[PDB]
């Protein structure tokens, strides 16, 4: 009876792989970016990357190649998952609908095989006869390619060499020839086979097995007009082909390992080279000719180019541009130039994509102490290292604050025909109208001629021809800049009130009910045009001359009343085109027409809070897309604001919301405000690029943040953050940190770049003497970060060869001080395991870092929580509970020993604890008995844990070695001396992500209980909530209904995907639900949606509600 729910909050951002080619069209250049279970598809351009398709998959993309057999119009995509789902995809655009189609698929795992060294490798013969694979030691799977083989049937051949490093097919080979580097006793060797598939074996490969260097690791296979193989070790790079052996040893590279490569020149004279360091190389192959004879190779060399992010994936594109995929930090777009700028760096960054990197640790914090949490993460490694701040929604900064319990509208207003700036704000009111002249930034209310005060203004827009307009209930008035009086005034021939207004900076359309007039602001007067009545009452109107319309406006749209409807109409004629008969007994409060970059838009709000938006045509004018929205529970009002280059639409509800732009779509993100009624852009000298926004009472003004449902702030560390605390009483973060350094000629240790810990404002170093008795080492610091400025206030450097591994911020014993405690360890490569380390207590004073108390320990402190005023701390294998003396020292109370190695610990407030390295997780009470530890229970499987958490008194979350999540509770069972000493795995789930951290927290607010967030090696931030058996079931069922309906990309089984899984167990998922999947429900067409129901009760669109009332859980 465990029931939980998991959702992605941030898709993974690390880039595990990426390929280039023509997959969209035979002419079109594509960049395929592989994340984990997300496939990004862009078209490269002059500018950069036209994003085009974003599919997710039910698998961890392990292999990714493009390729094209004969009689093929464009490239096809081969994809191999980490659970051995092969498949072959194709790009399919049915005019406007885009689709990725599965041309073939099948699962290629084998019952045998222990997975090899260097993990999976997929390769493809250039002639496209087949696909070669290495998944296991000793075997080599081959998937022969034919028009069919639509189930990718493959056979293994046997492989003498039990330990292969890398492998490619060679070029210019008659028979499909592989080439590989492998290690046996002695050293490493380079071997070749042919591959005949007829008889399925190998045969002999073109040339003798040669030797290669101890650390040869990459194999490049040079295209046709050269052929042969490039081999890359440390300090050294070599070429082989038949008798030909060319080699170089450029000290330049010795400094680091090559790690990724990429052909630039189809012919293959040039290649990029990636480095553990971030360095980028050009590898040059010097050709050479003779007449009626092809082309040898005379030499090859390396030329440093500069510095990218640390590259996994690396891909030349258009002229001198290079996509650089990074998992350790930010992926980026990069220009190589022929000349080197300042410092000799032929490399220039063009763009830069935010990668939450490895999230090594993280935590929550209400910075501006509000009610939402921000999130703060340690990220990257080495130079990419850094901190990232993450905040839900779009926020705004408030300047003035005039509380006006009424404001029923507002429009801009300049009082000078010159300046782009305005100085008045006229505002519809509680059956009145006030005005607001400004000394610029200062508030003042007066009067303007021909603008009623006791009559309630319905509009105020900026009409050209040097005049000011006020539509009131009664008249649509007119005023001037020149005359500035009763310049004109239109009164309804009958003494009947205006209902709906609509002034354009040139045109005017009012409505009297079903009555529709039309007037014009021609030089200093209001001339009239058409009259037309409608079926029912005019609900709402909008007119704005769209794209190819100077002032004068093309067609239009209008919400009506009793029939509840919206409809397409032209101008002085008033001719009905198309219309939608929406449901309900509540009318459209708001209808809007717009543009962005490449489209014209129609949107329509209802009184309930829900919207419908559809796509218009300034030419044809027909339907678009029907997909009601949620939004407020209150009538939404739509207005447009001034922003960047693609100005947007703000939605006023109780839940205020922006409508930005996606790929060519429209973002639908929260705005961080309590309630907004009406809103408009602004510019005054005193309040520029501002927006105005009123509520129940208060006018506010200010600018607007990024876009995305998430805004992300970052603090480059230049090194590798490890842990992170928040001492709030000190208004700062504490952060464990680490930089590398090298031996000197003096012996000691230099460094390799300025770091967060060397550029520190102040600084310390451990004095402590508790111990006695080229080359790389780590240097570790506690760091103190201003929570407001994100500066390295102070730095404490730790001992020579100490790792600080844990960090807490707490009060202790009776002592009223809030400390920063730090578990450490003396690490050495000759020791398989550390047996020395220390806990240290620290304080941050004025700007001071007091070393309050140390405490040597006989092991590595792996973690430590504040307990109940005491200090709990895992030491290497022991789990210990320290006390604070009034004499201000850490002294023992008790310890547990029954651990293979305690890595993680958490606390159920009371006296309950938990965790272990290669077992699964135990449960421990502390006892106000004799103050002892009692081991309540454990779980006997064997999960190399990575992360642990406690949801409640019974519920224990676990993440581990193999990207699985799992839950434990303890048995409700008679015979409580075994059935109690054991706790059962009541939830299992494959996340497909490696989790470093859990924590209670949430990103939202000011159905489901609890909320734990998690952070992954890959950039993914997910969330785990608890559920009610019923809700579980409503959703379990709905998972199954839903799977049948959705066509999964590589035709992969969702449930195969989510199946708990190790190298010795595969159970299906119990007691977990991905909203990820549930959320899919919303992307589905009503047809495919009705289906999901044939059946307390059962509806049809009832659930569409439930599913929104879920997304909003993060």
């Amino acid at each position: 009876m465990s029931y939980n729910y998991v959702v992605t909050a941030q898709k993974p951002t690390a880039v595990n792989g990426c390929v280039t080619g023509h997959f969209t069209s035979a002419e079109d250049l594509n960049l395929l970016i592989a994340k984990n279970t997300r496939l990004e598809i862009y078209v490269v351009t002059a500018e950069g990357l036209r994003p085009v398709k974003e599919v997710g998959m039910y698998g961890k993309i392990a292999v990714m190649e493009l390729f094209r057999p004969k009689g093929e119009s464009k490239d096809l995509l081969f994809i191999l998952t980490a659970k051995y789902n092969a498949c072959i995809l194709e790009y399919k655009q049915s005019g406007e609908s885009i689709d990725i189609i599965t041309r073939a698929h099948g699962n290629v795992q084998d019952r045998i095989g222990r997975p090899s060294e260097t993990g999976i490798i997929g390769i493809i013969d250039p002639e496209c006869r087949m696909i070669g694979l290495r998944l296991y030691d000793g075997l080599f799977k081959v998937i022969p390619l034919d028009r069919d083989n639509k189930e990718l049937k493959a056979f293994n051949i046997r492989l003498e060499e039990l330990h292969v490093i890398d492998v490619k097919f060679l070029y210019g080979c008659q028979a499909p020839t592989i080439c590989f580097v492998y290690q046996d006793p002695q050293g490493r060797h380079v071997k070749t086979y042919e591959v005949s598939l007829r008889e399925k074996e190998f045969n002999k490969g073109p040339w003798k097995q040669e030797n290669v260097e101890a650390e040869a690791s990459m194999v490049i296979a040079v295209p046709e007009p050269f052929g042969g193989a490039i081999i890359i070790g440390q300090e050294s790079i070599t070429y082989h082909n038949g008798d030909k052996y060319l080699a170089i040893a450029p000290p330049i590279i010795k400094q680091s390992t090559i790690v990724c490569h990429n052909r630039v020149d189809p012919n293959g004279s040039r290649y990029l080279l990636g480095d553990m360091e971030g360095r980028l190389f050009m590898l040059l192959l010097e050709k050479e000719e003779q007449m009626d004879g092809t082309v040898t190779l005379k030499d090859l060399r390396v030329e440093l180019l500069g510095e990218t992010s640390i590259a996994e994936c690396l891909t030349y594109l258009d002229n001198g541009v290079v996509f650089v995929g990074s998992r350790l930090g930010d992926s980026q777009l990069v220009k190589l130039n022929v000349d080197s700028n300042e410092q000799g760096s032929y490399v220039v960054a063009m763009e830069t994509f935010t990668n939450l990197g490895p999230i090594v640790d993280m935590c929550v914090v209400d910075l501006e102490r509000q009610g939402q949490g921000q999130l703060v993460t340690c990220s990257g490694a080495f130079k990419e290292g850094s901190l990232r701040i993450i905040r839900n929604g779009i926020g705004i900064h408030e300047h003035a604050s005039i509380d006006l319990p009424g404001i029923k509208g507002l429009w801009p207003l300049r009082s000078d025909p010159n300046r782009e700036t305005y100085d008045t704000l006229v505002l519809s009111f509680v059956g009145q109208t006030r005005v607001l002249m400004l000394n610029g930034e200062e508030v003042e209310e007066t009067e303007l001629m021909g603008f009623v005060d006791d009559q309630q203004t319905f509009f105020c827009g900026n009409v050209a021809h040097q005049q000011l307009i006020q539509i009131t209930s009664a008249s649509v008035r007119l005023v001037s800049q020149e005359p500035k009086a009763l310049v004109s005034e239109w009164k309804e021939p009958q003494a009947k009130n205006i209902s709906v207004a609509s002034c354009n900076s040139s045109q005017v359309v009012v409505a009297v009910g079903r009555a529709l007039y039309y007037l014009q602001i021609h030089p200093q007067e209001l001339r009239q045009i058409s009259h037309t009545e409608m079926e029912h009452e005019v609900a709402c109107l909008d007119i704005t001359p769209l794209g190819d319309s100077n002032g004068l406006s093309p067609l239009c749209a209008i919400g009506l009343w009793t029939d509840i409807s919206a409809r397409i109409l032209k101008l002085p004629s008033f001719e009905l085109l198309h219309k939608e008969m929406l449901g309900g007994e509540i009318i459209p409060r708001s209808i809007l027409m717009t543009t962005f970059e490449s489209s014209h838009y129609l949107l329509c709000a209802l009184g309930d809070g829900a919207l419908f938006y559809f796509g218009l045509n300034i030419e044809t004018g027909l339907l678009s897309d029907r997909k009601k929205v949620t939004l407020g529970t209150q009538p939404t009002v739509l207005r447009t604001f001034r922003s960047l280059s693609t100005t947007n639409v703000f939605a006023c509800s109780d839940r205020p919301t922006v409508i930005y732009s996606s790929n060519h779509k429209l973002v639908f993100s929260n705005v961080n405000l309590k309630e907004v009624n009406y809103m408009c852009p602004l510019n005054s000298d005193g309040y520029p690029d501002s927006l105005a926004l009123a509520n129940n009472s208060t006018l506010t003004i200010g600018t607007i943040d990024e876009i995305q449902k998430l805004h992300i702030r970052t603090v480059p560390l230049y090194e590798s953050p490890r842990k992170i605390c928040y001492q709030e009483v000190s208004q700062c973060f504490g952060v464990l940190s680490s930089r590398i350094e090298v031996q000197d000629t003096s012996g000691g240790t230099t460094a390799l770049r300025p770091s967060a810990s060397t550029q520190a404002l102040s600084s310390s170093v451990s004095s402590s003497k508790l111990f006695s008795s080229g080359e790389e080492v780590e240097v570790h610091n506690l760091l103190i970060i201003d929570q407001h400025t994100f500066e390295v206030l102070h730095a404490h450097q730790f001992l020579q060869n100490e790792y600080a591994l844990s960090l807490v911020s707490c009060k202790l014993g009776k002592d009223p001080n809030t400390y920063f405690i730090v578990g450490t360890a003396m690490v050495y490569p000759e020791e398989a395991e550390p047996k020395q380390g220390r806990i240290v207590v620290f304080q941050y004073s004025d700007g001071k870092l007091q070393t309050v108390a140390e405490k040597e320990v006989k092991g590595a402190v792996y973690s430590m929580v504040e307990f109940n005023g005491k200090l709990l701390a895992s030491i290497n294998s022991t789990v210990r509970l320290y006390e604070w003396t009034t004499e201000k020292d850490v002294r023992t109370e008790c310890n547990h020993y029954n651990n293979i190695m305690a890595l993680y610990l958490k606390t159920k407030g009371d006296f309950i604890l938990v965790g272990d390295l290669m077992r699964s997780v135990l449960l421990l009470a502390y006892k106000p008995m004799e103050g002892n530890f009692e081991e309540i229970a454990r779980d006997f499987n064997p999960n190399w844990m990575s992360a642990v958490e406690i949801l409640d008194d019974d519920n224990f979350l676990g993440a581990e070695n193999a990207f699985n999540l799992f839950v434990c509770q303890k048995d409700s069972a008679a015979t409580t001396d075994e059935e109690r000493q054991h706790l059962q795995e009541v939830g299992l789930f494959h996340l497909g992500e490696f989790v470093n951290v859990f924590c209670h927290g949430s990103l939202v607010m000011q159905p489901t209980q609890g909320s734990v967030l998690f952070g992954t090696v890959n950039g993914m931030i997910g969330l785990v909530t608890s559920l009610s058996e019923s809700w579980y079931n409503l959703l379990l069922d709905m998972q199954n209904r839903l799977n049948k309906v959705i066509k999964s990309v590589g035709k992969i089984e969702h449930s195969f995907w989510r199946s708990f899984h190790t190298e010795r167990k595969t159970e299906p998922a119990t007691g977990f639900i991905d909203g990820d999947l549930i959320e899919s429900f919303l992307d589905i067409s009503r047809p495919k949606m009705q289906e999901v129901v044939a059946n307390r009760e059962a509806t049809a669109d009832d659930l569409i509600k439930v599913v929104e009332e879920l997304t909003r859980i993060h």
Partner: peptide, 13 residues
């Protein structure tokens, strides 16, 4: 050393 592995089994490479 449990370290060399264990502080790297974060990075993930």
């Amino acid at each position: 050393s449990v370290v060399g592995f264990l502080s790297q089994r974060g990075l993930h490479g």
